[PDB]
Write a protein that binds this DNA or RNA. Structure first.
Ligand SMILES: [Zn+2]
Length: 339
RNA sequence: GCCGA
DNA sequence: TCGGCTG
């Protein structure tokens, strides 16, 4: 197929639809739109199920509301027949020549641009008093005290974010959050994650990037020699020596350093199918994956194993150091672990 | 539609 | 009340 013409004609034929948004991340071309087949919902205008994915070799229009998965050409056949002809002409026109997309291959990225020198309205946890509610809450979270120099507490999290990235929220309503600054390899903060307090925060638990090319891996600056253990939680990574944590829904293996010695230590969730998909895609890369198949504790994450089943960190490090598998042995491990 | 806040 | 989610 011809993906760039799919993206171009999808942008042409979906821009005039209501609630259109050109969601383009650095490898993914997606279009969000109200689906004209079903209309989505009057309440769910912003929650528009009309989705186009052009990052694949074929461009697919999948709407989850009316269950309408279709290529862009079928959409043009049903709705834009002038654009469909033009499409049929242009595809057989461009079949003869070679792809020219590679010719203007440039990058508009940048290095460290919004380097976070200070955190206004934030007090670090080690300089906070021992009877502070955030201090009592992290006492309930059982984080060791010596790492309390890595976490801040705020009450003005929208004001703090708008001090760094203005215009994120129209209202700076005061909100207590746990600031986890995510530093690069050289030790300076490139982002910060606003961890929800109490049972949950009101709204918008989001990692705030200083710039779109900033790191999403917390604790890279604290990596010493030995095997590097990757985790899903920054607080979960705080119980781990040489423990880093990816902060984001996208899991790029290339942006994670230590390719020789990274260890994937994910959640203990066998019933969860996306979890099985994550390890799967990790073992398909031939990577070193840590397996929860012989865990004496049955909680979800390492902090949970500590809080809810009374686990100590030394048992945790010996369990990860005794259960790194790779290759077909790991594949059989995931196999027997999955169900 | 499912999940997260 | 929002975004992101395969077929
Ligand atoms: Zn629809």
């Amino acid at each position: 197929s011809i993906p760039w013409i799919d993206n171009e004609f999808a942008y042409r034929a979906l821009a005039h639809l209501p609630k259109f948004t050109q969601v383009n991340n650095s490898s993914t071309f997606k279009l969000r739109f109200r689906c004209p087949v079903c209309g989505d919902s009057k309440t769910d205008q912003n929650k528009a199920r009309g989705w186009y994915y052009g990052d694949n070799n074929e461009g697919n229009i999948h709407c989850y509301n009316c269950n309408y998965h279709a290529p862009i050409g079928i959409y043009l056949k049903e709705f834009e027949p002038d654009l469909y002809r033009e499409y049929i002409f242009e595809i057989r026109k461009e079949k003869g020549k070679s792809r020219p997309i590679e010719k203007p291959k440039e990058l508009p990225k940048q290095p460290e641009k919004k380097i976070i020198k200070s955190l206004p309205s934030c007090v670090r946890l080690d300089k906070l008093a021992e009877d502070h509610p955030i201090i009592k809450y992290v006492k309930a979270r059982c984080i060791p005290k010596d790492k309390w120099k890595y976490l801040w507490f705020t009450t003005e999290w929208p004001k703090l974010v708008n001090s760094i990235a203005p215009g994120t929220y129209k209202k700076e309503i005061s909100e207590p959050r746990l600031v986890i600054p995510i530093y690069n390899a050289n030790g300076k903060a490139e982002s910060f994650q606003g961890r929800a307090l109490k049972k949950d925060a009101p709204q918008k638990y989001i990692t705030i990037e200083a710039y779109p090319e900033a790191t999403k891996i917390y604790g890279v600056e604290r990596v010493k020699d030995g095997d590097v253990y990757v985790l899903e939680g920054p607080i979960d990574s705080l119980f781990i020596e040489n423990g880093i944590a990816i902060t984001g829904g996208q899991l790029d293996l290339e942006v994670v350093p230590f390719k020789d010695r990274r260890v994937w230590v994910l959640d203990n969730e066998p019933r969860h199918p996306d979890t099985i998909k994550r390890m799967t895609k990790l073992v398909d890369a031939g990577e070193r994956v840590m397996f929860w198949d012989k865990s004496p504790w049955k909680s979800k994450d390492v902090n949970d194993m500590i809080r809810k089943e009374g686990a100590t960190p030394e048992q945790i490090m010996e369990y990860m150091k005794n259960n790194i598998a790779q290759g077909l042995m790991a594949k059989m491990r995931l196999s027997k672990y999955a169900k």
